[PDB]
Write a protein that binds this DNA or RNA. Structure first.
Lengths: 93, 107, 79, 98, 91, 107, 99, 79
DNA sequence: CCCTGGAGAATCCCGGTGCCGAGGCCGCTCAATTGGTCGTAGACAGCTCTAGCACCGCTTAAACGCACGTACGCGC
């Protein structure tokens, strides 16, 4: 039927990459899909919000870097920044 | 053309870079979306996903369960201080609350 | 449909307070909790009504309830 | 022959422990379903709700009331009490801005 | 450069309802921020409303739905009626 | 090129319809913006502006002032229940709070 | 002879009526301004603040503290008291969700 | 710059309580109010720091503080 | 009146059923991937000039401190 975009399998591979002996129910899967989408809307909304104030038309990696610093607090922020910085350097290389 | 290698594997990531980029373009955020912005978004989402699932897996072993069910996800979010402040205004269905009792409440 | 505010029974309000770690529950709490729940339901459902009316739909879906809860800082996961 | 005669408070704490580690829905389905339809019929008649739509409403309302009860209970010990009052809820909503 | 402001339009509104009083620039900045903050809230809700039903456009119904979602109580039906009257006068 | 008539005058409004339409277009909200959407937005903003200024003007007459000051705007917003709930999470500079004292505090 | 000797609370009510109708800022500009600089020194060593930048932070902090004091005061009468307590603020932040 | 948390003097905290309708002010409330103010400032100013850093600027503007307060649901009018 | 032994009942650990939701597999198809091509936002370089930073008189209302007692937090 109609293909609905979801992060059902993507969370599953993340779970097995850090915990290859546990599973996850569909109700917990839907919570994770809602959790990913809400954080996606918050950061992309913030990144769009940041670009409008600087009169900038594009959203770069620095837009996301500032967005996750504003939303995620403290130690959770800098690991996400470090993980984000590592991903961009690996992608460019 | 060349081999259709996914951008997630190029960046060493599991979350879809193309889906994030597609949702950023159709999500009505900016006129243009940069190249590294979906890569940064995928890394942040994956790290947040991996952090909670590891804590949910830790909570699952506390009650001796091999399947992640919504009580484990709620327990993982509230126990972590950073996840508590990040999701302070977030309601989790089928999760309940922390089983804590006031000090003066006990006999 | 009348007198449906009494559907939230006193043990149900008692059970809800037990989940919150409440030691003792007064007899006047149940009437107040019903009124608070009625006020909270009158805001979420009305917001969901406008969401359903905007979509040219006659049945309120779960997604519209999520958006009604999300706009007031009470976002819900799992639906 | 003597009855057990549990003193008040101990079984209430037992109910607290048995219901904090559990995840079943405390409010019954149809009583919450009928309350939604009565409230919605004041805003618009001939309105229907999906089964999962009420499911989203029921869990959100319980968690909001449980969190309100947590602040209501926290006000009781702050006021040197263990019994919650209707004025405790009114203070809780006022501080939250509701 | 030129900076966008809502100062003069509010002044004509002020003289329309109360021609016997003025306004200060310090209060003007508060009202300028007030109109702008409501502007992003309604447009943000209307943009979110269009994204929910996969709508690529924002109409008068998009603004009307955002008003009843944001403005509570009897204030909303005034703005709905005022918007409806302006729409009918526009055509 | 006929006579240039603003949409605000055609709709019986003082707020600029074209400015609202222009801000909606470059605000990255939607791909398309309707004709009545800025008209509806301007009318709603006009009513909200007129309602606050009327209450501020009524509040200004209370303390014998003929100029609207930020104290008057804060008093006008907080006195109205609809405006207080709408602007509950809004901070007003140089407005203070309502001059109300709790009943047990008076002698 | 004796002075007027106002009872405890009488001058407090006069200060309540005066500051609830006057919009002058209670916190002094310079001691608050230097508090911004030493807090921002932990995040950026070479940072500057505009006069209006410190101005906007002061009013938001004053209104937040006034709103916090309103909730703190209301908890006192709720707890059969007229004196605000540090546990009342801790209750106020937790109910508001600010820990 | 050290010991600047004491810049919020005792009458200044007392004046803030009087604006909030507080009748009696405890002697231990000044350390708690300073701690609450320090925590609140450590969030908004840090948020404005990231706003200033992202804007390719080395001086914090009031405009950046406006969005820093707005993103936490504490929008300020009058800048 | 407080300390300690025994027993009633809600709760916790454990063996057996199984079943229905979770895990794994097959297409395959539609959205992710590859290459090119421009309009164009953006990084970079030089000017500047308007507002913030640092120090100085001063004076004066704001603030620390001490003496006293009565409204009030707290114990019973």
């Amino acid at each position: 039927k109609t293909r609905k975009e979801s992060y059902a399998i993507y969370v599953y591979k993340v779970l097995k990459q850090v915990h290859p002996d546990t599973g996850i129910s569909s109700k917990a899967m839907s919570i994770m899909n809602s959790f990913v989408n809400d954080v996606f809307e918050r950061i992309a909304g913030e990144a769009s919000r940041l670009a409008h104030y600087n009169k900038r038309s594009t959203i770069t990696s620095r837009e996301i870097q500032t967005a996750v610093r504003l939303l995620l607090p403290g130690e959770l922020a800098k690991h996400a920044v470090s993980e984000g910085t590592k991903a961009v350097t690996k992608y460019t290389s | 053309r060349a081999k259709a290698k996914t951008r997630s594997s190029r960046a060493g990531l599991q979350f879809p870079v193309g889906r994030v980029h597609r949702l950023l373009r159709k999500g009505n955020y900016a006129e243009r979306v940069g190249a590294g912005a979906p890569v940064y978004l995928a890394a942040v989402l994956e790290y947040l996903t991996a952090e909670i699932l590891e804590l949910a897996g830790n909570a699952a072993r506390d009650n001796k369960k091999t399947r992640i069910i919504p009580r484990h996800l709620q327990l993982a979010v509230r126990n972590d201080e950073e996840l508590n402040k990040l999701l302070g205004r977030v309601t989790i269905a089928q999760g309940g609350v922390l089983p804590n009792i006031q000090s003066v409440l006990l006999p | 449909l009348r007198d449906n505010i009494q559907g939230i029974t006193k043990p149900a309000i008692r059970r809800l307070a037990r989940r919150g770690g409440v030691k003792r529950i007064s007899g006047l709490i149940y009437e107040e909790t019903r009124g608070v729940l009625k006020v909270f339901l009158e805001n979420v459902i009305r917001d969901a009504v406008t969401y359903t009316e905007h979509a040219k739909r006659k049945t309120v879906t779960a997604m519209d309830v999520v958006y009604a809860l999300k706009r007031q800082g009470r976002t819900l996961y799992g639906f | 022959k003597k009855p057990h005669r549990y003193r008040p408070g101990t079984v209430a704490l037992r109910e607290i422990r048995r219901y904090q580690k559990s995840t079943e829905l405390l409010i019954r389905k149809l009583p919450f379903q009928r309350l939604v339809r009565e409230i919605a019929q004041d805003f618009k008649t001939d309105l229907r709700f999906q089964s999962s739509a009420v499911m989203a409403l029921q869990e959100a309302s319980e968690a909001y009331l449980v969190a309100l009860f947590e602040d209501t209970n926290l006000a009781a010990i702050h006021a040197k009490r263990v019994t919650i009052m209707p004025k405790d809820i009114q203070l809780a909503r006022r501080i939250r801005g509701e």
